[PDB]
Design an enzyme around this catalytic site. Structure first.
Site, PDB file in Angstrom:
ATOM      1  CG  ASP A  25     -21.755  22.914  29.876  1.00 49.42           C
ATOM      2  OD1 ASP A  25     -21.708  22.976  28.632  1.00 49.42           O
ATOM      3  OD2 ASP A  25     -20.753  22.725  30.614  1.00 49.42           O
ATOM      4  CB  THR A  26     -19.889  23.419  35.592  1.00 46.28           C
ATOM      5  OG1 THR A  26     -19.064  22.338  35.124  1.00 46.28           O
ATOM      6  CG2 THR A  26     -20.952  22.907  36.521  1.00 46.28           C
ATOM      7  N   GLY A  27     -19.178  24.285  32.366  1.00 47.97           N
ATOM      8  CA  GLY A  27     -18.193  24.879  31.471  1.00 47.97           C
ATOM      9  C   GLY A  27     -18.751  25.958  30.567  1.00 47.97           C
TER      10      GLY A  27
HETATM   11  C1  LIG Z   1     -15.219  26.603  27.790  1.00 45.22           C
HETATM   12  C2  LIG Z   1     -15.112  26.010  26.410  1.00 45.22           C
HETATM   13  C3  LIG Z   1     -16.258  25.034  26.150  1.00 45.22           C
HETATM   14  C4  LIG Z   1     -15.942  24.216  24.899  1.00 45.22           C
HETATM   15  C5  LIG Z   1     -17.575  25.812  26.040  1.00 45.22           C
HETATM   16  N1  LIG Z   1     -18.724  24.946  25.671  1.00 45.22           N
HETATM   17  C6  LIG Z   1     -19.344  24.239  26.821  1.00 45.22           C
HETATM   18  C7  LIG Z   1     -18.950  22.754  26.795  1.00 45.22           C
HETATM   19  O1  LIG Z   1     -19.350  22.143  28.018  1.00 45.22           O
HETATM   20  C8  LIG Z   1     -19.522  21.970  25.605  1.00 45.22           C
HETATM   21  C9  LIG Z   1     -21.028  21.706  25.724  1.00 45.22           C
HETATM   22  C10 LIG Z   1     -21.455  20.947  24.488  1.00 45.22           C
HETATM   23  C11 LIG Z   1     -21.704  19.588  24.576  1.00 45.22           C
HETATM   24  C12 LIG Z   1     -22.066  18.847  23.460  1.00 45.22           C
HETATM   25  C13 LIG Z   1     -22.221  19.500  22.242  1.00 45.22           C
HETATM   26  C14 LIG Z   1     -21.979  20.864  22.138  1.00 45.22           C
HETATM   27  C15 LIG Z   1     -21.603  21.596  23.263  1.00 45.22           C
HETATM   28  N2  LIG Z   1     -18.796  20.716  25.466  1.00 45.22           N
HETATM   29  C16 LIG Z   1     -18.040  20.368  24.425  1.00 45.22           C
HETATM   30  O2  LIG Z   1     -17.832  21.093  23.453  1.00 45.22           O
HETATM   31  C17 LIG Z   1     -17.463  18.966  24.448  1.00 45.22           C
HETATM   32  N3  LIG Z   1     -18.246  18.067  23.619  1.00 45.22           N
HETATM   33  C18 LIG Z   1     -18.907  17.010  24.082  1.00 45.22           C
HETATM   34  C19 LIG Z   1     -19.579  16.161  23.041  1.00 45.22           C
HETATM   35  O3  LIG Z   1     -18.950  16.714  25.273  1.00 45.22           O
HETATM   36  C20 LIG Z   1     -16.019  19.027  23.967  1.00 45.22           C
HETATM   37  C21 LIG Z   1     -15.187  19.793  24.977  1.00 45.22           C
HETATM   38  C22 LIG Z   1     -15.392  17.660  23.667  1.00 45.22           C
HETATM   39  C23 LIG Z   1     -15.408  16.766  24.884  1.00 45.22           C
HETATM   40  S1  LIG Z   1     -19.766  25.608  24.610  1.00 45.22           S
HETATM   41  O4  LIG Z   1     -20.850  24.715  24.504  1.00 45.22           O
HETATM   42  O5  LIG Z   1     -19.053  25.701  23.375  1.00 45.22           O
HETATM   43  C24 LIG Z   1     -20.242  27.076  25.158  1.00 45.22           C
HETATM   44  C25 LIG Z   1     -21.387  27.141  25.968  1.00 45.22           C
HETATM   45  C26 LIG Z   1     -21.798  28.353  26.514  1.00 45.22           C
HETATM   46  C27 LIG Z   1     -21.076  29.510  26.256  1.00 45.22           C
HETATM   47  N4  LIG Z   1     -21.279  30.785  26.684  1.00 45.22           N
HETATM   48  C28 LIG Z   1     -20.387  31.658  26.212  1.00 45.22           C
HETATM   49  S2  LIG Z   1     -19.150  30.975  25.211  1.00 45.22           S
HETATM   50  C29 LIG Z   1     -19.938  29.482  25.455  1.00 45.22           C
HETATM   51  C30 LIG Z   1     -19.531  28.253  24.910  1.00 45.22           C
END
Ligand SMILES: CC[C@H](C)CN(C[C@@H](O)[C@H](Cc1ccccc1)NC(=O)[C@@H](NC(C)=O)[C@@H](C)CC)S(=O)(=O)c1ccc2ncsc2c1
EC number: 3.4.23.16
Lengths: 99, 99
Positions: A25-27
């Site tokens: 997860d690059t995000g």
């Molecule tokens: C930068 C903000 C971002 C929201 C941080 N997260 C990472 C993100 O990629 C998540 C991953 C995800 C997927 C499915 C279920 C739950 C999560 N995607 C999601 O929450 C996405 N959900 C899905 C189902 O793809 C949504 C965006 C809707 C498409 S995150 O998961 O909320 C996140 C991860 C690491 C971290 N470190 C410090 S703050 C922080 C926040």
């Protein structure tokens, strides 16, 4: 390897003696693992996602092998619906986005 | 480009004629941008992740140029913490994960 993004980039990781499926997860700044009872000291932390914040336990210097590649670093543990490998570990395994 | 991950993979996008900075997020199924106006019909949708769900506006078949690469696809608009380019558009621009 090369991983396309047609589906979720789930890979097998090895951590604390379990194999788990985790999203590359690059995000994600940090690595966030589904609730698991890791040994050792931790610090509380809150991390913010799409729906708001969750409370997590921050464990440091945890070895994690991501299909074949060894990493070691901070792992956050809490009620995430998916195991998330974040940039802190992706950088260590030399992972890039390419287009 | 090849983009490493020691920093957030933030890139400039162009959408509805406006420049914005968005996060290339392989952990996101969908593309969701902070509240903004987009032309055309939208439908209410809910999307979720850590912290649960939010309400968004779903715009279909929206052109977005991402770091100079053209995509046309679904863009969700709502109270996301950050502008997120998800897999629906990352696939269109030929983005893969490599290590
Ligand atoms: C930068 C903000 C971002 C929201 C941080 N997260 C990472 C993100 O990629 C998540 C991953 C995800 C997927 C499915 C279920 C739950 C999560 N995607 C999601 O929450 C996405 N959900 C899905 C189902 O793809 C949504 C965006 C809707 C498409 S995150 O998961 O909320 C996140 C991860 C690491 C971290 N470190 C410090 S703050 C922080 C926040």
């Amino acid at each position: 390897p090369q991983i396309t993004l047609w589906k979720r980039p789930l890979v097998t990781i090895r951590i604390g003696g379990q194999l788990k499926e985790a999203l590359l997860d690059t995000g994600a700044d940090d690595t966030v693992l589904e609730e698991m009872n890791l040994p050792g000291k931790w610090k509380p932390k809150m991390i913010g996602g799409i729906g708001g914040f969750i409370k997590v336990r921050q464990y440091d210097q945890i070895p994690i092998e991501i299909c074949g590649h060894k990493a070691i670093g901070t792992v956050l543990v809490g009620p995430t619906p998916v195991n998330i490998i974040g940039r802190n570990l992706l950088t260590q395994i030399g992972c890039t986005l390419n287009f």
